[PDB]
Amino acid sequence: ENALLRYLLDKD
Amino acid sequence: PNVPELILQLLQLEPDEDQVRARILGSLPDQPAAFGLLCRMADQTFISIVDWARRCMVFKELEVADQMTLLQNCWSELLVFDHIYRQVQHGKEGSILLVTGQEVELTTVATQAGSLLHSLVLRAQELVLQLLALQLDRQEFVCLKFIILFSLDLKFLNNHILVKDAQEKANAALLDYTLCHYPHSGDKFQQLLLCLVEVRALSMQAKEYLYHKHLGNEMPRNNLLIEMLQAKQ
Ligand SMILES: CCCCCCCCCCCCCCCC(=O)OC[C@H](COP(=O)(O)OCCN)OC(=O)CCCCCCCCCCCCCCC
């Protein structure tokens, strides 16, 4: 799973 | 006149009022291309596209896993389409407009770009020319990018019901608008869908250009587009 996408969607 | 309500709601979400450019953060006798900075600029544009998508109707109602799949499916298409529409707004055959406000002459890319990048740029400009001949407008633009966002087969997601509705409502909206606003020859709905096929083909060439740079260790070490490339599509 894409850690970057989770980050940008969760927050920044 | 009676613009579909989905298209109306999407225009209200469109962030551009000069704000995209301000928010973009690479922090500011002619010369070689500023490669690392161009990379940075593209990464920040990706960021802003995810910001856009997470504010979109339907999308913001899905759970994170589905949101990720959808964006994993379309991220390169959204970036290419973002660049393309910028070029229709620019309306100059001789140069490229970047999100920073900077224009790059096509002769410049002919002198500096390798085989792959040069092909890509040129093929993209052909598509710009096509959308200009169809008199592409901002209403169509935001509808088409919502369509790209939800252009994933239902089977790959948990929530079928809502994604199917979005896919159907988005196409219906485009047809309704083109039919009412472009009473000219050619089926504009269908022509625009054909354009989306080209956006997808372009975005595939773009990932391959990216992958080429990556194998030769030419990309910045913490590039976002490479991180997106490497995560299982
Ligand atoms: C999937 C993502 C898509 C993002 C698209 C949105 C951003 C548009 C950016 C376009 C900038 C062009 C300036 C070129 C000036 C020049 O001629 O410079 C030539 C240099 C070097 O060229 P070379 O690498 O061939 O190496 C030759 C030497 N060995 O290249 C650049 O500096 C390009 C830097 C781009 C970095 C961001 C990565 C974006 C991915 C694909 C870009 C192609 C998109 C084209 C449209 C489909």
Side-chain angles (χ1 to χ4, degrees), chain B residues 10-45:
Chain B
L10 284 168
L11 291 160
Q12 292 294 59
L13 311 186
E14 200 58 31
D16 203 14
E17 178 141 348
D18 296 333
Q19 201 210 249
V20 173
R21 179 157 31 227
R23 314 243 118 177
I24 293 219
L25 281 155
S27 301
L28 303 173
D30 252 48
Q31 2 95 351
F35 190 85
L37 211 294
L38 291 170
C39 288
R40 232 137 289 148
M41 172 192 82
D43 276 357
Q44 288 302 309
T45 303

Short mmCIF file of all heavy atoms in Angstrom, two decimals, chain B residues 10-45:
data_model
loop_
_atom_site.label_atom_id
_atom_site.label_comp_id
_atom_site.label_asym_id
_atom_site.label_seq_id
_atom_site.Cartn_x
_atom_site.Cartn_y
_atom_site.Cartn_z
N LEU B 10 -18.28 21.16 -9.30
CA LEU B 10 -16.86 21.02 -9.58
C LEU B 10 -16.11 22.33 -9.85
O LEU B 10 -14.93 22.43 -9.54
CB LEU B 10 -16.63 20.07 -10.76
CG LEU B 10 -16.78 18.58 -10.49
CD1 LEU B 10 -16.81 17.84 -11.81
CD2 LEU B 10 -15.67 18.08 -9.63
N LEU B 11 -16.76 23.31 -10.45
CA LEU B 11 -16.14 24.62 -10.68
C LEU B 11 -15.89 25.33 -9.38
O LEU B 11 -14.90 26.03 -9.24
CB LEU B 11 -17.03 25.50 -11.54
CG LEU B 11 -17.17 25.03 -12.97
CD1 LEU B 11 -18.41 25.65 -13.60
CD2 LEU B 11 -15.88 25.34 -13.77
N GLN B 12 -16.82 25.17 -8.45
CA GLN B 12 -16.69 25.76 -7.13
C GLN B 12 -15.53 25.16 -6.33
O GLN B 12 -15.01 25.80 -5.44
CB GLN B 12 -18.01 25.64 -6.36
CG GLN B 12 -19.14 26.50 -6.93
CD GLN B 12 -18.89 28.01 -6.80
OE1 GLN B 12 -17.90 28.53 -7.31
NE2 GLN B 12 -19.80 28.72 -6.13
N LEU B 13 -15.14 23.93 -6.65
CA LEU B 13 -14.00 23.30 -6.00
C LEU B 13 -12.70 23.66 -6.67
O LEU B 13 -11.64 23.52 -6.08
CB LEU B 13 -14.13 21.77 -6.00
CG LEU B 13 -15.45 21.16 -5.54
CD1 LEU B 13 -15.33 19.66 -5.49
CD2 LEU B 13 -15.90 21.69 -4.19
N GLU B 14 -12.76 24.10 -7.91
CA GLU B 14 -11.55 24.38 -8.67
C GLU B 14 -10.78 25.48 -7.92
O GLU B 14 -11.32 26.57 -7.68
CB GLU B 14 -11.90 24.79 -10.11
CG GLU B 14 -10.78 24.65 -11.15
CD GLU B 14 -10.24 23.26 -11.28
OE1 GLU B 14 -10.99 22.30 -11.07
OE2 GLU B 14 -9.03 23.12 -11.58
N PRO B 15 -9.55 25.19 -7.49
CA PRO B 15 -8.79 26.11 -6.63
C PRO B 15 -8.24 27.32 -7.38
O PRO B 15 -8.00 28.37 -6.76
CB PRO B 15 -7.63 25.24 -6.13
CG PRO B 15 -7.40 24.31 -7.21
CD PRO B 15 -8.77 23.97 -7.78
N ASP B 16 -8.01 27.16 -8.69
CA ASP B 16 -7.36 28.22 -9.45
C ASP B 16 -8.13 29.51 -9.33
O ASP B 16 -9.27 29.63 -9.80
CB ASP B 16 -7.19 27.86 -10.93
CG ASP B 16 -6.05 28.65 -11.61
OD1 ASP B 16 -5.22 29.27 -10.89
OD2 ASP B 16 -5.91 28.70 -12.86
N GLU B 17 -7.50 30.43 -8.60
CA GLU B 17 -7.74 31.86 -8.68
C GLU B 17 -6.35 32.54 -8.50
O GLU B 17 -6.24 33.60 -7.84
CB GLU B 17 -8.77 32.29 -7.63
CG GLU B 17 -9.07 33.79 -7.58
CD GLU B 17 -10.54 34.12 -7.35
OE1 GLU B 17 -11.39 33.18 -7.44
OE2 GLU B 17 -10.84 35.32 -7.07
N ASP B 18 -5.32 31.91 -9.09
CA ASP B 18 -3.89 32.28 -8.97
C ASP B 18 -3.19 31.59 -7.79
O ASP B 18 -1.98 31.74 -7.57
CB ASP B 18 -3.67 33.82 -8.93
CG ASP B 18 -4.09 34.51 -10.23
OD1 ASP B 18 -4.05 33.85 -11.29
OD2 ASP B 18 -4.45 35.70 -10.31
N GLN B 19 -3.97 30.80 -7.07
CA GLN B 19 -3.59 30.31 -5.76
C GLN B 19 -2.72 29.07 -5.89
O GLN B 19 -1.86 28.85 -5.06
CB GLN B 19 -4.85 29.99 -4.95
CG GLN B 19 -4.63 29.96 -3.45
CD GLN B 19 -5.59 29.00 -2.74
OE1 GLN B 19 -6.49 29.45 -1.99
NE2 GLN B 19 -5.40 27.68 -2.97
N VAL B 20 -2.96 28.27 -6.92
CA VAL B 20 -2.16 27.07 -7.19
C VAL B 20 -0.67 27.48 -7.34
O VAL B 20 0.21 26.97 -6.62
CB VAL B 20 -2.70 26.34 -8.44
CG1 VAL B 20 -1.80 25.17 -8.89
CG2 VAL B 20 -4.11 25.81 -8.14
N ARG B 21 -0.42 28.43 -8.24
CA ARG B 21 0.91 28.99 -8.47
C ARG B 21 1.60 29.58 -7.24
O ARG B 21 2.80 29.37 -7.04
CB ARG B 21 0.80 30.08 -9.53
CG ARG B 21 2.09 30.78 -9.87
CD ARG B 21 2.11 31.43 -11.25
NE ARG B 21 0.77 31.89 -11.65
CZ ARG B 21 0.20 31.67 -12.84
NH1 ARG B 21 0.83 30.99 -13.80
NH2 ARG B 21 -1.03 32.14 -13.06
N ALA B 22 0.86 30.34 -6.43
CA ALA B 22 1.41 30.88 -5.19
C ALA B 22 1.84 29.73 -4.27
O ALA B 22 3.01 29.63 -3.87
CB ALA B 22 0.36 31.75 -4.49
N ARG B 23 0.89 28.85 -3.98
CA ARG B 23 1.11 27.71 -3.10
C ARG B 23 2.27 26.82 -3.58
O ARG B 23 2.90 26.18 -2.74
CB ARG B 23 -0.19 26.86 -2.92
CG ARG B 23 -1.51 27.66 -2.63
CD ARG B 23 -2.20 27.42 -1.26
NE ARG B 23 -2.28 28.62 -0.41
CZ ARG B 23 -2.88 28.67 0.79
NH1 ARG B 23 -3.49 27.59 1.30
NH2 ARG B 23 -2.88 29.81 1.49
N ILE B 24 2.59 26.79 -4.88
CA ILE B 24 3.67 25.90 -5.36
C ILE B 24 5.05 26.43 -4.92
O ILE B 24 5.36 27.60 -5.12
CB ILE B 24 3.52 25.59 -6.90
CG1 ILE B 24 2.24 24.76 -7.10
CG2 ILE B 24 4.79 24.91 -7.48
CD1 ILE B 24 2.29 23.62 -8.14
N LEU B 25 5.84 25.52 -4.32
CA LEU B 25 6.86 25.82 -3.26
C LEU B 25 8.37 25.70 -3.58
O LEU B 25 9.20 26.02 -2.71
CB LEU B 25 6.65 24.90 -2.03
CG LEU B 25 5.54 25.22 -1.03
CD1 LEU B 25 5.09 23.93 -0.29
CD2 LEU B 25 5.97 26.32 -0.04
N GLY B 26 8.74 25.20 -4.76
CA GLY B 26 10.13 25.37 -5.19
C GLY B 26 10.41 26.87 -5.08
O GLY B 26 9.75 27.69 -5.73
N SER B 27 11.36 27.24 -4.24
CA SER B 27 11.34 28.61 -3.73
C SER B 27 12.26 29.63 -4.46
O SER B 27 13.07 30.33 -3.83
CB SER B 27 11.56 28.59 -2.20
OG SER B 27 10.54 27.81 -1.57
N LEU B 28 12.08 29.73 -5.79
CA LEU B 28 12.53 30.89 -6.60
C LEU B 28 13.92 31.43 -6.23
O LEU B 28 14.07 32.58 -5.78
CB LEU B 28 11.50 32.05 -6.53
CG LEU B 28 10.03 31.83 -6.94
CD1 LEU B 28 9.14 33.05 -6.63
CD2 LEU B 28 9.93 31.49 -8.42
N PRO B 29 22.18 35.49 -23.19
CA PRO B 29 22.91 34.62 -22.25
C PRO B 29 21.99 33.74 -21.41
O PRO B 29 21.86 34.00 -20.20
CB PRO B 29 23.67 35.64 -21.38
CG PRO B 29 23.95 36.87 -22.34
CD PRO B 29 22.95 36.72 -23.51
N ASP B 30 21.37 32.72 -22.01
CA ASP B 30 20.55 31.77 -21.25
C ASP B 30 21.10 30.33 -21.22
O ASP B 30 22.09 30.04 -21.89
CB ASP B 30 19.08 31.83 -21.70
CG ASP B 30 18.18 32.50 -20.65
OD1 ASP B 30 18.56 33.60 -20.15
OD2 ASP B 30 17.10 32.00 -20.27
N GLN B 31 20.45 29.46 -20.45
CA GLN B 31 21.15 28.36 -19.76
C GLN B 31 20.51 26.99 -19.91
O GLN B 31 19.50 26.85 -20.58
CB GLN B 31 21.31 28.69 -18.26
CG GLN B 31 20.70 30.01 -17.74
CD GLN B 31 19.29 29.85 -17.15
OE1 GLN B 31 18.66 28.79 -17.26
NE2 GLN B 31 18.81 30.92 -16.52
N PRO B 32 21.13 25.96 -19.32
CA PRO B 32 20.50 24.64 -19.27
C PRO B 32 19.20 24.57 -18.43
O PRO B 32 18.99 25.36 -17.52
CB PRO B 32 21.60 23.76 -18.65
CG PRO B 32 22.88 24.53 -18.84
CD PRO B 32 22.47 25.95 -18.71
N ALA B 33 18.33 23.62 -18.77
CA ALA B 33 17.09 23.39 -18.01
C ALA B 33 17.40 23.12 -16.55
O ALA B 33 18.37 22.42 -16.23
CB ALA B 33 16.30 22.22 -18.59
N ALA B 34 16.59 23.70 -15.66
CA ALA B 34 16.72 23.48 -14.22
C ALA B 34 16.03 22.17 -13.82
O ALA B 34 14.96 22.20 -13.23
CB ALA B 34 16.12 24.67 -13.48
N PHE B 35 16.66 21.04 -14.12
CA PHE B 35 16.07 19.71 -13.95
C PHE B 35 15.46 19.44 -12.57
O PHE B 35 14.28 19.10 -12.48
CB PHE B 35 17.09 18.61 -14.30
CG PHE B 35 16.48 17.22 -14.38
CD1 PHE B 35 15.89 16.77 -15.55
CD2 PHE B 35 16.50 16.36 -13.30
CE1 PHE B 35 15.32 15.48 -15.62
CE2 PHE B 35 15.93 15.07 -13.37
CZ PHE B 35 15.35 14.64 -14.53
N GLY B 36 16.24 19.57 -11.50
CA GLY B 36 15.77 19.27 -10.16
C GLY B 36 14.56 20.10 -9.75
O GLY B 36 13.66 19.65 -9.05
N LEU B 37 14.55 21.34 -10.20
CA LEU B 37 13.51 22.28 -9.87
C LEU B 37 12.26 21.96 -10.66
O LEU B 37 11.16 22.08 -10.16
CB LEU B 37 14.02 23.70 -10.18
CG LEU B 37 13.52 24.85 -9.32
CD1 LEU B 37 12.02 25.07 -9.53
CD2 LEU B 37 13.90 24.62 -7.84
N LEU B 38 12.44 21.53 -11.90
CA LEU B 38 11.32 21.09 -12.72
C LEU B 38 10.68 19.86 -12.11
O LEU B 38 9.46 19.72 -12.16
CB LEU B 38 11.78 20.81 -14.17
CG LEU B 38 12.20 22.08 -14.96
CD1 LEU B 38 12.87 21.74 -16.27
CD2 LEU B 38 11.00 22.97 -15.17
N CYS B 39 11.50 18.99 -11.54
CA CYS B 39 11.02 17.80 -10.83
C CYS B 39 10.21 18.20 -9.62
O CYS B 39 9.13 17.71 -9.43
CB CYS B 39 12.19 16.92 -10.39
SG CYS B 39 12.99 16.05 -11.76
N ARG B 40 10.76 19.10 -8.83
CA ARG B 40 10.11 19.65 -7.65
C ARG B 40 8.75 20.24 -7.98
O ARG B 40 7.79 20.05 -7.27
CB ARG B 40 10.99 20.75 -7.04
CG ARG B 40 11.30 20.64 -5.57
CD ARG B 40 12.77 20.97 -5.24
NE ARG B 40 13.66 19.90 -5.73
CZ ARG B 40 14.92 20.06 -6.18
NH1 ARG B 40 15.52 21.26 -6.23
NH2 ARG B 40 15.60 18.98 -6.58
N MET B 41 8.70 20.98 -9.08
CA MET B 41 7.50 21.65 -9.54
C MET B 41 6.42 20.66 -9.86
O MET B 41 5.27 20.89 -9.55
CB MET B 41 7.82 22.49 -10.77
CG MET B 41 6.64 23.09 -11.48
SD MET B 41 7.12 23.75 -13.07
CE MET B 41 7.10 22.29 -13.99
N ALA B 42 6.80 19.56 -10.49
CA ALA B 42 5.87 18.50 -10.88
C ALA B 42 5.33 17.74 -9.67
O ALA B 42 4.17 17.33 -9.65
CB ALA B 42 6.53 17.53 -11.86
N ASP B 43 6.19 17.59 -8.66
CA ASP B 43 5.86 16.90 -7.42
C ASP B 43 4.83 17.70 -6.66
O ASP B 43 3.91 17.13 -6.08
CB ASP B 43 7.11 16.77 -6.53
CG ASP B 43 7.98 15.57 -6.89
OD1 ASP B 43 7.59 14.78 -7.79
OD2 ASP B 43 9.08 15.34 -6.29
N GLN B 44 5.00 19.01 -6.65
CA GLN B 44 4.09 19.90 -5.95
C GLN B 44 2.75 19.98 -6.66
O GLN B 44 1.74 20.18 -6.04
CB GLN B 44 4.69 21.31 -5.85
CG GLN B 44 5.83 21.44 -4.89
CD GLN B 44 5.44 21.02 -3.48
OE1 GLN B 44 4.42 21.48 -2.94
NE2 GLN B 44 6.23 20.13 -2.88
N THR B 45 2.77 19.84 -7.97
CA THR B 45 1.56 19.78 -8.77
C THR B 45 0.84 18.50 -8.44
O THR B 45 -0.38 18.48 -8.37
CB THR B 45 1.87 19.84 -10.26
OG1 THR B 45 2.61 21.01 -10.56
CG2 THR B 45 0.62 19.99 -11.06
#
